[PDB]
């Protein structure tokens, strides 16, 4: 939701998490599949130059 | 709302702008920020992870 503002001391402000509006969902990160696969395969074919 | 499962509520008391008086406040801290204070078997005396 928001930066709920708690006041501490003579003028110090501490910002925290207030409510949550909406439902709860998970935090994800998305990578494309085939781009990752052939980039990984290119690293593989460039890594067999050192290991025979 | 009874179904968050990653963030706790964690109400506490704190010092206001007058250092004589204290007030009751609440937040929503994330779960890896918080460790239990093992002075008993009660799972309600939680604390912040940086306090030691």
């Amino acid at each position: 939701n928001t930066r709920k503002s708690v006041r501490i001391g003579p003028g110090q402000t501490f910002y925290a998490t207030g409510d949550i509006i909406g439902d709860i969902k998970q935090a994800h990160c998305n990578i494309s599949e085939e781009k990752w696969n052939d980039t990984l395969q290119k690293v593989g074919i460039e890594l067999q130059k050192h290991f025979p | 709302s009874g179904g968050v499962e990653e963030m706790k509520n964690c109400s506490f008391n704190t010092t206001t702008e007058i250092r004589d008086k204290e007030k009751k406040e609440y937040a929503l801290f994330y779960k890896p920020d918080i460790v239990p204070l093992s002075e008993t078997n009660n799972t309600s005396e939680y604390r912040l992870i940086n306090c030691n």
Partner: antibody
Amino acid sequence: QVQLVQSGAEVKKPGASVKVSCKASGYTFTGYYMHWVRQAPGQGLEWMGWINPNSGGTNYAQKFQGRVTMTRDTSISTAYMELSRLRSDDTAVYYCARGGWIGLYYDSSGYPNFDYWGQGTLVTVS
Amino acid sequence: QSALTQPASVSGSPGQSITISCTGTSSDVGSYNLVSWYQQHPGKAPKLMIYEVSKRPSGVSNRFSGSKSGNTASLTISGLQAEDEADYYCCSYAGSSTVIFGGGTKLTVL
């Protein structure tokens, strides 16, 4: 196929509480949102807050907070409503409807895509 | 944040197109494109006509069409018959997981 059945018509006194049930059959009940609406006779429909039958999460609309509670039960697969402190214009018809898909990665709560409905419940007060 | 602004009623002769519209608040309709249209027959449950501003559901004839332009949202029907004796309702997202409906447009055939 698919069914959304509710209870029969009820008459009540002001200041009481009324319980409205909505049973879903024919599909996996814990995989979709449920939104409820209320229609006074003569005027249009009126939204009420939704329910998440997986984790029991609740959100309610404005001018309804405090006097409505919405629960679910996955063993009987039925959503319940307890509405206390009735008032004179609450003689109406109550519907339950199926919402969006529980996506686990995107917020599909307020998506206004209601496909299947119940038969309606008549609630009268005097 | 009241109900969406909707006309009172419209009248339509059979066999001609007619357009009905809602207007609202830019924070509700003018930002999010999650606008749906429902219709009601007197006595039974309502039935959905459109999901998005224009993306067709199943089990409906290829006759309704929806559009969104800024604040305004509109439904056009073409070649209307007497089977559409219903009243129409807007349905919109509003933020904070709240849904705002509309007033209602009674449709009378000739």
